[PDB]
Design an enzyme around this catalytic site. Structure first.
Site, PDB file in Angstrom:
ATOM      1  N   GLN A 161     -23.825  -6.480 -18.783  1.00  0.00           N
ATOM      2  CA  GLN A 161     -24.602  -7.676 -18.484  1.00  0.00           C
ATOM      3  C   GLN A 161     -26.019  -7.605 -19.042  1.00  0.00           C
ATOM      4  O   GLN A 161     -26.474  -8.549 -19.692  1.00  0.00           O
ATOM      5  CB  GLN A 161     -24.645  -7.904 -16.961  1.00  0.00           C
ATOM      6  CG  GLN A 161     -23.665  -7.068 -16.141  1.00  0.00           C
ATOM      7  CD  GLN A 161     -24.373  -6.007 -15.321  1.00  0.00           C
ATOM      8  OE1 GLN A 161     -24.404  -4.835 -15.695  1.00  0.00           O
ATOM      9  NE2 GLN A 161     -24.974  -6.420 -14.212  1.00  0.00           N
ATOM     10  N   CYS A 163     -24.001 -10.955 -13.580  1.00  0.00           N
ATOM     11  CA  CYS A 163     -22.981  -9.988 -13.198  1.00  0.00           C
ATOM     12  C   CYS A 163     -21.635 -10.642 -12.963  1.00  0.00           C
ATOM     13  O   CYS A 163     -20.600  -9.984 -13.135  1.00  0.00           O
ATOM     14  CB  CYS A 163     -23.386  -9.237 -11.919  1.00  0.00           C
ATOM     15  SG  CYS A 163     -25.195  -9.202 -11.609  1.00  0.00           S
ATOM     16  N   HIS A 178     -24.882  -7.918  -5.727  1.00  0.00           N
ATOM     17  CA  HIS A 178     -24.231  -7.535  -6.986  1.00  0.00           C
ATOM     18  C   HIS A 178     -22.787  -8.031  -6.957  1.00  0.00           C
ATOM     19  O   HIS A 178     -22.320  -8.559  -5.946  1.00  0.00           O
ATOM     20  CB  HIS A 178     -24.283  -6.021  -7.223  1.00  0.00           C
ATOM     21  CG  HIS A 178     -24.519  -5.625  -8.652  1.00  0.00           C
ATOM     22  ND1 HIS A 178     -25.740  -5.176  -9.108  1.00  0.00           N
ATOM     23  CD2 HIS A 178     -23.687  -5.594  -9.721  1.00  0.00           C
ATOM     24  CE1 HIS A 178     -25.651  -4.887 -10.394  1.00  0.00           C
ATOM     25  NE2 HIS A 178     -24.416  -5.133 -10.791  1.00  0.00           N
ATOM     26  N   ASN A 206     -16.877  -1.413 -13.103  1.00  0.00           N
ATOM     27  CA  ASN A 206     -18.289  -1.765 -13.095  1.00  0.00           C
ATOM     28  C   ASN A 206     -18.585  -2.561 -14.355  1.00  0.00           C
ATOM     29  O   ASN A 206     -17.829  -2.519 -15.327  1.00  0.00           O
ATOM     30  CB  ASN A 206     -19.193  -0.529 -12.994  1.00  0.00           C
ATOM     31  CG  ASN A 206     -20.440  -0.787 -12.181  1.00  0.00           C
ATOM     32  OD1 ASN A 206     -20.848  -1.935 -12.001  1.00  0.00           O
ATOM     33  ND2 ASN A 206     -21.050   0.278 -11.681  1.00  0.00           N
TER      34      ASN A 206
END
Ligand code: NA
Ligand code: NA
Ligand code: NA
Ligand code: NA
Ligand code: NA
Ligand code: NA
Ligand code: NA
Ligand code: NA
Ligand code: NA
Ligand code: NA
Ligand code: NA
Ligand code: NA
Ligand code: NA
Ligand code: NA
Ligand code: NA
Ligand code: NA
Ligand code: NA
Ligand code: NA
Ligand code: NA
Ligand code: NA
Ligand code: NA
Ligand code: NA
Ligand code: NA
Ligand code: NA
Ligand code: NA
Ligand code: NA
Ligand code: NA
Ligand code: NA
Lengths: 9, 241, 98, 9, 241, 98
Positions: free
Chosen positions: E36, E42, E174, E204
């Site tokens: 990102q 995100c 997040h 992730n």
């Protein structure tokens, strides 16, 4: 599971 | 049959039989050769090659195990663009061992996935892996392979078809199997540290038609602790017995 | 450094620039950018069956660019062709993988 | 130096 | 909109199941991790990774989908300062498809633009379903990796090859994914006790430089709600099939 | 009520008054003034592939700002950078950037 009698080939 | 150190009158020893050398692809060793193909995954080769070679050595089993099962998923290594040997087999004492050949190939990593809980057959390891440079003075006193590191001066892959002497690359770039040590002649001396006829056979992951037809002989001392190229840094010995 | 990988970037010497011109022949039959000649000021190199270079070249309005090729192993002329296309990708993608 | 250091008589 | 009222019914409804460790990543289904990078986005990674996943887990045709046809094509979401996977999912169920990753590239925090007719790729979902907080060790197992959200501590950003035995964030700000779980036989730092610690494999959107390949592992047990950072409050998943 | 983004404002910690001090090291982009470092007022934070700690400051004839700064991920060396800066604003108008 797939162990003896199930699997193909 | 009776091959080497045998006291016959008075003096003895500690399994220190020669202090000489012969190669170990000839006396029970070596697996076939393989091409790395727009992928730098040499960790895979050396690492899973040692599992398969220790098979053909420890047991006369002969497994030609695959390479795109730690390069389709070892989600602890960073791709075909990464991976180590410090811990490149420690992901097959947790995976069950890698899935094998003749039911799975290597395919160059056009962005791909894992096929690991698909097979009926697996072959893996039991013991650990680390050979110190204090076991690379007798290197292959195991009668079996090692997974050392080589830096390439890029005057390396130069199809010398022979020997290379010199101050090698900069960082331990590529991963190289140890198919043994050879002993051609011994020092033919100079003013200091004369001509080295002694040699070190090591397999590679680059190609099948390269130098000594898939292999590379280099230049050791009487022992194996005065070369360059930083070999003896990352040696590992994956065993199953 | 990494078995199969590398370390940080190195200063752009004219030999990766000759690899550059070979990449640009390839680059124009299937790139919308009817392409041509460029200017190379960054790179990294890898230990593959070849030498897996990346070429940071500058192009476009104010973006920059990146590519992949390999000096093949000394089989015959080392006649490098592709293995990566990421056009007009900035000077700040940490020297990518394509 | 100790891989088979048979020193002495 | 729709939920687990008539959808889990076929997979783990009419059938009950069981396991202790099932990762759709060692199972020919999940796709690459990406980044990102300073743009407040995100959410884009989660959504596009999600659609990639299900296509490959169902008809096993891989797609790398694009997060720049999202971030700037938000019609109801926010953009490069923040966004909502709940509705990024649905902005996709009004467009017609998402461009493949390399049919519409990605920049960073730099002011670029959006087009949807620079594609003919119809990589879309017919609808999507909402996944509760509680069922998340059985949501990533039959229905696919759920596009979860996480919290961020400044401890979180620092990784290694291990399970998180550290503290957490001051809010759940997040967005990540969840791929699976497992069990690991271990010792006690003081004893020789049979301690078996469970984990959660999550992906992730930070670098594939991260120790476990953009898969970081945190605290959860066979209960499913030992979350040490709130892993599963926003956790909905798209439905291509 | 958003997963992944910015968060409504906050008074102060002086360890984002360590990243304000690094303003003068990461200027001479378009600055045009003589201010030999800017003096800070309030605090803000973002959470992306790094801790992009937001912060604002002052000037010469008292006109403030709303910047888009960036610290580093757990990667390479000590780099603090400038992504987007601006000036000529009021103390009541607060930090933005999209
Ligand atoms: Na059948
Ligand atoms: Na057999
Ligand atoms: Na260990
Ligand atoms: Na099993
Ligand atoms: Na050279
Ligand atoms: Na001899
Ligand atoms: Na000397
Ligand atoms: Na050492
Ligand atoms: Na040249
Ligand atoms: Na074209
Ligand atoms: Na022109
Ligand atoms: Na090509
Ligand atoms: Na004596
Ligand atoms: Na005596
Ligand atoms: Na309801
Ligand atoms: Na219905
Ligand atoms: Na619409
Ligand atoms: Na903290
Ligand atoms: Na911390
Ligand atoms: Na480290
Ligand atoms: Na504790
Ligand atoms: Na206890
Ligand atoms: Na204690
Ligand atoms: Na309030
Ligand atoms: Na402090
Ligand atoms: Na100060
Ligand atoms: Na005045
Ligand atoms: Na804006």
């Amino acid at each position: 599971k797939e162990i003896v009698n199930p699997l193909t080939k | 049959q009776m091959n080497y150190e045998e006291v016959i009158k008075k003096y003895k020893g500690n399994e220190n039989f020669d202090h000489a050398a012969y190669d170990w692809r000839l006396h029970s060793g070596v697996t076939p050769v393989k091409d790395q193909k727009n992928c730098g995954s040499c960790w895979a080769f050396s690492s899973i090659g040692s599992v398969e070679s220790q098979y053909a050595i420890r047991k006369n089993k002969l497994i030609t195990l695959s390479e795109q099962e730690l390069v389709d998923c070892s989600f602890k290594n960073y791709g075909c663009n990464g991976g180590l040997i410090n811990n490149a087999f420690e992901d097959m004492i947790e995976l069950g061992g890698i899935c094998t050949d003749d039911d799975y190939p290597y395919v160059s990593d056009a962005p791909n996935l894992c096929n690991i809980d698909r097979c009926t057959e697996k072959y893996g390891i039991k013991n650990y892996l680390s050979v110190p440079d204090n076991k690379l003075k007798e290197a292959l006193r195991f009668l079996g392979p090692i997974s050392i590191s080589v830096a390439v001066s890029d005057d390396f892959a130069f199809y010398k078809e022979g020997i290379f002497d010199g101050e090698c690359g900069d960082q331990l770039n590529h991963a190289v199997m140890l198919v043994g040590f050879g002993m051609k002649e011994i020092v033919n001396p100079l003013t200091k540290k004369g001509e080295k006829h002694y040699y070190y056979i090591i397999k590679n992951s680059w190609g099948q038609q390269w130098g000594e037809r898939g292999f590379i002989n280099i230049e050791t001392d009487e022992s194996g602790l005065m070369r360059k190229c930083g070999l003896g840094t990352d040696a590992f010995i994956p065993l199953i017995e | 450094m990494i078995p199969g990988g590398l370390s940080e970037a190195k200063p752009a010497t004219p030999e990766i620039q000759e690899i550059v011109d070979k990449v640009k022949p390839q680059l124009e039959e299937k790139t919308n950018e009817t392409y041509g000649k460029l200017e190379a000021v960054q790179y990294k190199t890898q230990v593959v069956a070849g030498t897996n270079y990346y070429i940071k070249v500058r192009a476009g309005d104010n973006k920059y660019m990146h590519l992949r090729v390999f000096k093949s192993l000394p089989g015959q002329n080392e006649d490098l062709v592709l293995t990566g296309y990421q056009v007009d990708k900035n000077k700040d993608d940490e020297l990518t993988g394509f | 130096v100790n891989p088979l250091t048979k020193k002495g008589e």
